[model samples]
Target: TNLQTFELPTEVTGCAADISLGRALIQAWQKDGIFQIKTDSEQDRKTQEAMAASKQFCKEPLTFKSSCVSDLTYSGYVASGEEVTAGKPDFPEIFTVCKDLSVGDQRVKAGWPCHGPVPWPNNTYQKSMKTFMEELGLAGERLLKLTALGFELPINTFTDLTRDGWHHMRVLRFPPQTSTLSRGIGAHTDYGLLVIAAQDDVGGLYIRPPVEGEKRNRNWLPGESSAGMFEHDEPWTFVTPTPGVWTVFPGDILQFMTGGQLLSTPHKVKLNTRERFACAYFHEPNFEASAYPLFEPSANERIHYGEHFTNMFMRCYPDRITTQRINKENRLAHLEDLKKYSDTRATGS
Candidate 1:
């Protein structure tokens, strides 16, 4: 792990930041064994059959899943101060606690926690999940302040807006495969302020430069597509993961807020050799937080989070979503598999 500045790929816009979240924490949570679970999303026989047949994997392992239209990925969901539609046990869960910002003088006020419509359990996984989120959120806060410092803005410039934003961390695992080109994940940008992509040993993260020019192309990726990887427009710069650190970058909203200053380069993944595992914790502004341009010299109008969160859930979940069952004869897999994997492959992450 010879960490150096220019060793990793970067965008000329100065868009990416590689920061450490402490090897102690990373090693702890990972070896806690919460991360060792199935990562495939194929459910039905037709889907599962297609997944194994997918020509994405190299010839050696032979664990290719071509039949399924989606990639083999799994993620757990958690919401900030918002309501998430209850899908399976894991999808139905909520992450209530986050960093509260009241004031040195005050524009950020956290809510009063009350008895919810239903009582969220005081179970072990809930405790662990909450702990992980809080730690990750704190890491994001630090990055926000650093961003402000770098821009010569008020110390709390970004922190003020990030009070209680919508976010969820995905524990990612791209099963072992070999391909210079495989759509493990399609090209896209995170929707919020910061995305701290913490990685495992295996590496294969690629990013393309911004669309170039003053404005950006809104509909970059197609509405109904999930097969082919992004190519041709620009060659991708690959990132080889370093232990204990996360690859951070601004999202579309942040770039929009900066009036095209902070770059939100589109990124995708190609499974290289070994199994890939990483945790991507996204940080954003409160649901109604303004996407107002900050430090833009003279810009003044403020835009509320218009369909911001709506589009986030719509995009990421479908790719990381999975269904699972152990027996070969019975392929009973699903979003519930995430909950099952974390809890017992049986009660419930």
Candidate 2:
């Protein structure tokens, strides 16, 4: 309930009119690092279509969905317990989708991961999903531009890097919680610059806002340092899932770019009665860009976007042979059983 709610701006350009709104949203971001945007009719329709597509896709037979599962590029269906967060198997079955690049695309040539094909369920599903992603992409870019204005920086400060960025989306379905299954996803900060997520009315999301005087987390590896909550004793408050209200939050990379000025809040999910469906869009920087503090001196070193992303991907999918092989070329490597960060017996069971 600490999350603030702001109306989505019609456009980011009417500077004289929206500066006040942008400032208020920025104030909320400063305090909570997350907020909700009240959606308009167009956005509501897009959300509906996307949510419906997820429901349809997840209801497909496991054997049919299994054909789309790819551990190699992390591009397709991620079965329950297939993806790990904070060293624990996340409880959601998800389909990861992204723009498919051609064989000769520069990123593909450079071996940048997550730049190839997305095994769509059907043409109709793919169309709706891509439209939803594009809608979110517009809002994200607009928000970034406003964020710069709120910080009194040039309007294009962040947008310049975000243009043609490597945006990724995950359509997730969390099954009903049973006696043994309570955690839908482990506590962790997101890996990209901004995360815009849409959820249905089945509420379970909770966020721990930054405590006063605690410095921003510099570690790009989420769930290890600042995300470690057992040490802090702060309450995890729920993020109410209001219809047509999309949840937006800054991520680790944004904190790095701002030199700790912006907070990247930690969040997780605890499910109970209903099956939940949500779509999360991760808006990232250009794959080849290097991130450093734009305005202030920073203790954190410059982060090469692609390599850092690859590092975290390998950590999340350590069991994948592709990730293991990538580990050879690079290096391989959180919340349940947080005392030591892992339960020896409860891994995939």
Candidate 3:
């Protein structure tokens, strides 16, 4: 039997260039994921003042600093015990907050996760990136254009649903390790539409293909030699961006929205003997937008298309049922009996 490897498409020079740019962005992402602009020394002095204020507040005992007495307040919520209307999840809230702030207020603090609202100048780093892509010629444009096209809707559709969309970075800071461990970030796909990730040079990101084939007889038989083709262990492919690139990876939700035109790549971070830090941007769509197929040409028209596209979408993601089933199965065995008896039965027996 002939072995097949999953290869990136090369028909369009743009797509090929895009893939290379994607790899390059991965490199820059690994270096410094943050964008910085130095302010005058006066701003630094004000920052120090704020830090002092925060430390002073932290020094007081919990009893004296209770909400009733404290002058400091949270802008997000009021102290009323009454339940107000519920808000969207944490991720989208970042974008929502960005929409509220003005242009000059484009300050983002470290240690907090956030995504920006559309039309925000800072989020669209593509302007600066375009010149860089142009130097690579048509191929670079192809890759860069595809990325911009993919984000067109989420960028334009600024509705209530968009409020649920978010962009935030997560950092995984680890202490110096003496040995490797199996528990890094467990094998799982991201829940958003897209991700822009930057990893450090310590090198621990691992992308694993799905397992295939079965064991034979008593001895654990290995599958075909090509069953799993792992990418080289070096961090070379995880592009370190210069001034012009940013690594981008599509997420499961984005793949679902695009009807699988885009694919969510499965990846994981591996435990290493040294400390590491990584930053990633989670780009998501508005929750209210329907994730229906966008293909045109009705079946009755001269253009004939199969139902498989719709079926494939459903098959790839089986609604909420799969998650519900998994949750039930994972529930503690001790709680099962109690839940059953409390809901439908009269006696413990």
User: Which candidate has the highest lDDT of all?
Assistant: 2
List TM-scores for all candidates, in order: 0.53, 0.87, 0.37
Candidate 3: residue 106 lDDT (0-100): 23
Q: Please provide, for model 3 over 1-349, each residue's C-alpha lDDT reduced to its tens digit, 9 standing for 90 to 100.
A: 1111122233333444544544443332223222221223432343233323323433445333232110110111111111111111111011101112222332211101121222212322222222222221222223333443344432222122223333333323333344444334433344454555444455565543223231111100112111112323322122332222234554554344444444454555554566554444455443223333334324222100111111221222232232233234542232233334332222224
Q: After superposition, how far is residue 300 of candidate 3 from its true place, in Å?
A: 19
RMSD of 1: 16.0
Write down the worst ten-residue block by lDDT for model 3. 88-97
Off by over 4 Å in 2: 221-232, 297-300, 328-349
Model 2, span 1-349: residue lDDT tens = 6467787675787376566666776788777768898888989899899889889888899999878844336667888888887567888988887666655665444444545567778999889988888888999888888888777778887787776787888888999987676988887777778899988888888877767786555657444444344322566778887876888888878888877777677888887599998888898886555677877564457776655666676677777655765555442211111213222222123
RMSD to truth, every model? 16.0, 8.6, 17.5
lDDT of 2 at 254: 85
Candidate 2 displacement at residue 268 in angstroms? 0.1
Q: Report lDDT (CA) for all predictions.
A: 0.43, 0.74, 0.31
* Model number with the top TM-score: 2
List residue ranges in candidate 3 displaced over 4 A. Answer: 1-145, 148-164, 208-245, 296-349
